[PDB]
Amino acid sequence: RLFNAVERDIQKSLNKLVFEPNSQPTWQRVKAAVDSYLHSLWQQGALAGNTPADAWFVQVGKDLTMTQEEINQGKMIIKIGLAAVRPAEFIILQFSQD
Amino acid sequence: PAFAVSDDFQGKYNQGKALNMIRTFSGQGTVVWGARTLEDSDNWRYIPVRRLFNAVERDIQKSLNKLVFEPNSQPTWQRVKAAVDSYLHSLWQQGALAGNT
Amino acid sequence: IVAAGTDTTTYTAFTTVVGQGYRIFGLFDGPKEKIAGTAKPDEVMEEYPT
Amino acid sequence: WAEFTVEYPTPLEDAFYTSLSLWFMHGGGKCYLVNEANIADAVAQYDDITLIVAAGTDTTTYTAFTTVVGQGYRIFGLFDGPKEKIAGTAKPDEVMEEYPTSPFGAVFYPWGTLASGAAVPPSAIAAASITQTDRTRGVWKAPANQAVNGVTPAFAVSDDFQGKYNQGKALNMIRTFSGQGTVVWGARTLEDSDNWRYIPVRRLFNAVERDIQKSLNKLVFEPNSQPTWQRVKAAVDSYLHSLWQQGALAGNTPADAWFVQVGKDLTMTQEEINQGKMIIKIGLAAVRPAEFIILQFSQD
Amino acid sequence: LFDAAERDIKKALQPMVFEPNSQLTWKRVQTAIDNYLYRLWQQGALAGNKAEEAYFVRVGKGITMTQDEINQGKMIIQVGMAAVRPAEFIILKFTQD
Amino acid sequence: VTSVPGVYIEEDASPAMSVSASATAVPLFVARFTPLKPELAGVITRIGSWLDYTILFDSNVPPTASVALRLYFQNGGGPCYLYPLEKADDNGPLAALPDLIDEVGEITLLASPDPDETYRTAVYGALAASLDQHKGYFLLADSVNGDAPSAVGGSAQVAVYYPNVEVPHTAPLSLPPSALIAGVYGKTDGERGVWKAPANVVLNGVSDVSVRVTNEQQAELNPKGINVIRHFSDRGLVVWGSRTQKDDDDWRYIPVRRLFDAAERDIKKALQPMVFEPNSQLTWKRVQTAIDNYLYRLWQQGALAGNKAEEAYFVRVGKGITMTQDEINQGKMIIQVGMAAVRPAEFIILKFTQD
Amino acid sequence: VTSVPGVYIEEDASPAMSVSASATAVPLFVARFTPLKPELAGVITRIGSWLDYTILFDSNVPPTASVALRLYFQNGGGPCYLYPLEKADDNGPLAALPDLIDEVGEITLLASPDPDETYRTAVYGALAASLDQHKGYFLLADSVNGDAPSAVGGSAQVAVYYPNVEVPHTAPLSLPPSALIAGVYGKTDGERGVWKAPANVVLNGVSDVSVRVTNEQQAELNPKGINVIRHFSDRGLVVWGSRTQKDDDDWRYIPVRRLFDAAERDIKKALQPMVFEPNSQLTWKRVQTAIDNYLYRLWQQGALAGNKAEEAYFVRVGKGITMTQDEINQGKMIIQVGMAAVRPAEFIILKFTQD
């Protein structure tokens, strides 16, 4: 349900950004708008990790993704990836003497 | 599935031709099992390696219909050669066809 | 080209459009019920176009 | 197949209806249909005939076949076998004198039965194996191991009944194996001479000249001089070199594979130049099927 | 975009249509076209990166021309842009890592 | 071939092939049984385990065929076939036996667990002709007394195991050991492979031999090569000796015979798809390579007794070598291939010295 | 695939996997019982404790199956199975036994608490074939007298405990110790793990052994490896010796056999979800890592006898190494993996010196 609800708000919002020019000021604006939502979600304890460059990543460009020929077909492809939290279903504890 | 087949009745129908039974396991259920075509030759088995060659040419043949009757010269030869491999390079990073370099 | 319970006249029309080279991939049905498994591994397999 | 159905709306049982339905179902193309009294006219007109098959006719067909061979039309027929069930007790030869001995044709015995409908004469089964062969890989390869579909043979012949009918003449049985099924088996013509056996080596020479004879019709009445001789010699070997890389005729150092020569005193001396004649000769060595594969073990 | 960029430069070259074909005319035309695409580049309409590669307007005599079409009085303006495409079919492709 | 301009599609077809190995196991048995259905009277039937044998057939009460067959599964697994026949001199189905074995492509071993001599020697002469056209059989046999049987006199493919083995049943009944010795060939090819002689393998579940053999008449029976079931104190019963019948230095050993018998059957099964292709030069280098990559994989797993050089194979298929022009016209190919197998190590000699 | 402009949603699917360990315990027993309901006649039944055994089954009065099973729970816990059958020679359900064990994925040990010899040796030969296709079984056995039983002659997975143990009941009745020795494998894997040989563990609740063994015939019985129940004065009865049957230096010890038997069953269960994936290079590095992170966790808890270097595993899955091109076409993968297990320390030798 974390991955199920982290995309139904991005897909709802980007409907007013289609047919926009696929240029350089667009790529630095979606990249700066998505991670400002994930940073609000990292402090709330939803997805775990220190150094919050390690918790998620967002990338959008010209040659890391979506090379020149599929730009001419209009496509604007991105990819983001993030590591969520998982329940502590099993709790084992070890005694020793030291 | 209406029947419970075996573990070994798959075995004697795996050579020659390609019965490709539908068998239910524990956990995952009623799954398909075995992807083999009718011949056993080392070029044409393995149904996904047939559909890969079957769908890698129906998009080139669909596109080159607007390039016939074009002059058979030097700037044509360096343009089709530079347009096909830019489609295969998009298909190599996706893990469709295997090989380094 | 799938077969929804037709075998006899379907196998001829399948190999027809292969003969002109239309680059298609059909898929067929099996035998009806209960290969006994006592014997005969091959005689259930000649009615299918190789 | 489109106009064949609107002409013949009902499915019939006759030998010709079961033959064309087996031709088109394995691909096929532009095919004719003539009565058995007008082969000698239809071949001399339409200028593209290659095969004369027999859809269940023997008596009056063998005369019209050897007629158009007598004028030298460079054609290759193929015949039917005997009807049913050689008992195999004896008599290997008396079933084979009713067939005209010539380097054109085969017989294709076992009479496949077409388990959907009625019987099929085996000339249609042999003609379907050539169609998916030349479209796939050349004409120099024999219609030999490419499988047909939807046809089962009525009999199960043997492993050794092939053996006593492999010499002298060329029964060329149709035998079903495990795995690959109902395949044809054996590509042999009627004589046993070391120049003319092996049906694909006949059709190679049969089709390597019907394109040269078709092209040189616009070069007759040309001046028989020196710039002509160096132009035909440079145009023929550029066609053979395209045919040597494709694996049709075998040999390294492709001066060894063929030869072309045309001149003034090696051929066609001065007096027969004054009569107008322009004679050439070319010779080439084709490939032959590996019908027998023997293998030897040792210890070294 | 190409339909409007042509109509503005074609309307202003019409006052200079019978001037001599010397070298000082060439550098004055090549500059007034250079200062038109640069203003249009820096307002987000030519899809080029932070380099200059959005225009290659050249009007020389060694390049883009030669001597014998000067005698049948001509000029050749090789110019070219790199326009921007609209962004449709936005694809997300979430991953686990 | 091309008239309308259009765009045409075309692929390269070739029968390019490789060779993969099957198993050397799963025999058939020609003893007498009691089938339950009339269609199981005279046809070869595949049996997968001991479970499905109890469904198709039965266990009767007086009767050694049901006892001798369950000892096959306790030693080594694998499926097996069986051919039930009732009368020893019924030469109808006995003549109709060898033309049923050929249609199933797998059959490797041959055996008969029936006790008496009049039934076994009627069988061994019925299919003795089907051993010398090199299709790949290897039968087993037992000896009624101290010398070999004469139904198959001298051949490269037999093996004789002399002393018969008994088994307790409700007085213990004797049993000719040709049944349970087929199962011990199914373990050696599992972990060790074909090229290991089965001797140190231990018989799994028996009381004792019928007659106790000692070392002083082992010396006589180990020539005129027949094998022997031995008894030891610490480890119990064990098979011993791995020598075949005829005793020239060509093939005196079971694995050297069975290594060439299995290497031929895998390459002959895969050359059958390419049997009518043209005899040009590009076919020759494609066959010579697919045979080269089969012996090299088998060399580097310790089965060809060659040193760290390449000298274990010399497969050549050329036209100047190994052929000439005039047998191309009567279409032929010649595959000169040869291996260097490994011999079992018996008679270990120490020869201590002072220096 | 994309026609309407819109916005499309898409995720990356991958079968990326890891391996987690199960337990090596909970056998089934094939002794005779008295079920209460007719559907409990011939089917495997899970028993959780001693409480639910008293609900489904009963305790009768003449009868050793109810006594031998409650001693299992007093030693070590864990659930267990049981398969009731009534007649020793009823080879119907005995043939129908091994095709019921495979459908339950867990079964590790095998035992039979029935007293007499005619019932046990009929069982031990019935499922002796199901030990050599490497699915992961390990049975236990008892000896009728001073030498090993011959129903399973030589195998890597047996264990024999010689002297039978008695127990007081209202004259004390004897009991073959294969029942209560299964429960002592359930304590050693609890705290110490699999890789510790159970010897110093103390039998929990018994009077005395049937025959008193001494050290001078311990010397004879510790070779031809069979184990022994000993009696000591200060600590009472104790099990002794942890050697398996066949005595090459490959596997002579119970834990070295049972360590490789449990490491295979956990990685084979998790590779089963990825069994039809393409054979490219990114699949190879994802499998080689998930095996690497399984032996490293098992190394740093003291079960692989390697030093402070890495040398305990060399798992490699490449294409240049360990494979080549022509077995890709007959789709295969090869996982060369290898460990270095730890041996138990017996025969401690002091050898004092002066300097």
Give the per-residue SS3 of chain E.
CHHHHHHHHHHHCCCCCCCCCCHHHHHHHHHHHHHHHHHHHCCCCECCCCCCCCCCCECCCCCCCCHHHCCCCCCCCECCCCECCEECCEECCEECC
Which residues on F lie below 8 Å from C35 (Cβ)? none
DSSP string, D161-174: TTTTTSSSS----E
In the three-class reduction of DSSP (H, G, I as helix; E, B as strand; rest coil), residue G230 is classed as strand
Distance CA G165, CA G173 (A): 9
F286 to each of E67, F280, F291, F300, how far by Cα in Å? 62, 11, 9, 22
Terminal CA-CA length for chain A: 43
D206 contacts chain C (CB < 8 A): no
CB nearest to G2's CB, from E89, E94, E96 = E89
Query: With touching defined as 3+ CB pairs under 8 A, do chains C and G touch?
Result: no
Which of C18, C24, C38 should be substituted to probe chain F, the one whose Cβ sees the most F Cβ atoms within 10 Å?
Answer: C38
- Which of G125, G224, G324 is opposite residue F234, by nearest beta carbon? G224
Separation of first and last alpha carbons in chain D: 61
* Longest alpha-carbon distance in chain A: 68
Distance CA F334, CA F340 (A): 20
Q: Do chains F and D touch (3 or more CB pairs under 8 A)?
A: yes
**Method by which the coordinates were obtained:** cryo-EM
Find, among G109, G327, G93, G344, the residue nearest to G242 by Cα. Answer: G344
On the 0-12 / 13-18 / 19+ scale of CB atoms within 10 A, A7 is middle
Chain C positions in Cβ-Cβ contact with residue D28 (cut-off 8 Å): 19
Angle formed at CA F157 by CA F155 and CA F160, multiple of 5 degrees? 90
Backbone region of residue F89 per phi and psi (left: phi > 0; alpha: psi in -120 to 50; beta: other values): alpha
Q: How many Å apart are CA A62 and CA G275, to the nearest integer?
A: 37
Amino acid residing at F267 = I
* Residues in CB range of F192: below 8 A, 6 or more apart: none
Find out whether F165 and F175 touch, Cβ atoms under 8 Å.
yes
Edge-first strand listing for the sheet containing A76-77: A76-77, E90-91, G7-8
DSSP letter string over B33-59? Answer: -----S---SSS-SHHHHHHHHHSSTT
**Cα–Cα distances in Å, from G23 out to B26, F216, G19, G194, G261?**
19, 54, 13, 9, 12
Task: Give the span between the Cα atoms of F126 and F104, in whole angstroms.
Answer: 19
Q: Which of B7, B46, B100 lies closest to G331 in CB terms? A: B46
Indicate the burial class of A82 (C-beta count within 10 angstroms; 0-12, 13-18, 19 or more): buried
Exposed/middle/buried for residue G157 (C-beta within 10 Å: 0-12, 13-18, 19+)? buried
The tokens describing D90, both together, are 């004896």
User: What does DSSP say about strands G109-111 and G45-47: parallel, antiparallel, or unpaired?
Assistant: unpaired
The answer to whether D11 contacts chain C (CB < 8 Å) is no
From F13's Cα to the closest Cα of chain B, the distance in A is: 9
Q: Which of G7, G11, G12 sits opposite E90 (nearest CB)?
A: G7
Chain A CB contacts of B86 below 8 Å: 67, 69
For residues D179 and B16, the answer to whether their CB atoms sit within 8 Å is yes
Q: Which of C21, C38, C39 sits opposite F9 (nearest CB)?
A: C21
Polymer length of chain A: 98
- Tokens representing B27? 């956990």
* Rounded CA separation G63/G266 (Å): 39
Do D300 and F314 make contact, defined as CB atoms within 8 angstroms?
A: yes
DSSP-based three-state secondary structure for F120: helix
Neighbours of chain F (3+ CB pairs under 8 A): B, C, D, G
CA-to-CA distance for F331 and D287, rounded, in angstroms?
Answer: 10
Pairwise CB contact (< 8 Å): G7 & A19: no
Sequence-distant (≥ 6) Cβ neighbours of residue G158 within 8 angstroms: G139, G140, G141, G152, G244, G245
Contact G284, G257 (CB under 8 A): no
Q: Which residues contact D51 (CB under 8 A, 6 or more apart)?
A: D75, D76, D77, D78, D127, D130
Strands G109-111, G28-29: pairing is parallel
Task: Nearest chain A residue to G11 by CA: give it.
Answer: A79
Dihedral sign for Cα F172, F176, F182, F185, please. positive
Cβ neighbours for F22, distance < 8 A, ≥ 6 positions apart: F106, F265, F266, F269
User: SS3 of G284, please?
Assistant: helix
Contacts A–B by Cβ distance under 8 A? 4
Residue F110 CB coordination number (10 Å) = 24
**E17 class by beta-carbon count within 10 Å (0-12 exposed, 13-18 middle, 19+ buried):** exposed
**Nearest chain G CA: its distance from F73 CA (Å):** 6
B16 in reach of chain C (CB within 8 A): yes
Interface touch G7/A7, C-beta < 8 Å: no
- Measured in residues, chain E has a length of 97
Q: Distance between alpha carbon G196 and the CA centroid of its chain, in Å?
A: 13
Q: Provide the H-helix boundaries in chain D.
A: 2-7, 17-24, 39-46, 61-70, 122-137, 199-207, 212-215, 226-244, 270-274
Does C31 reach chain D within 8 Å, measured CB to CB? no
> Which two structure tokens, joined as six digits, stand for G245?
């049957």
Dihedral pair phi/psi, residue G51, rounded to 5°: -70, -55
Chains E and A touch (3+ CB pairs under 8 A): yes
Of D286, D235, D228, nearest in space to D260 by CA: D235
Contact F7/F1 with Cβ under 8 angstroms?
no
B46 Cβ contact partners less than 8 Å away, ≥ 6 residues apart: B35, B36, B37, G331
Tokens of G199: 């010897």
H or E stretch at F240: strand F236-240
Interface contact C25-B54, CB threshold 8 A: yes
D138 φψ region: left (φ > 0), alpha (ψ -120 to 50), beta (else): left
The answer to whether G5 and E89 are in contact (CB under 8 A) is yes
Give the residue on E whose Cα is nearest the Cα of A25. Answer: E44
Tell me the C-alpha distance between B95 and B88, whole Å: 11
| CB-based contact, D116 to chain B, within 8 Å | no
Mention every residue, 6+ apart, whose C-beta is less than 8 A from residue G212. G231
Chain C interface includes B32 (CB < 8 A): no
Beta-carbon neighbour count of residue D190 at 10 Å? 20
Residues in E closer than 8 angstroms to A18, CB to CB, are 87-88, 90
Nearest CA in chain D to B13: D179
Who's near G311: CB < 8 A, 6+ residues apart?
Answer: G340
Do the strands G236-240 and G228-232 form a parallel or antiparallel pair, or are they unpaired? antiparallel
**How far G99 CA lies from chain B's nearest CA (Å)?**
11
Nearest to A70 by CA among E87, G83, F286, E80: E87
In this structure, the strands spanning F236-240 and F228-232 are: antiparallel
Nearest-CA neighbor of G24 among G190, G219, G209, G226? G190
Neighbouring-strand partners of residue F232: F236
Looking at the DSSP bridge assignments, the partners of residue F278 are: D289
d(CA G310, CA G328): 31
* Residue E92 · residue G10 · CB < 8 Å: yes
Which tokens go with F246? 């005829």
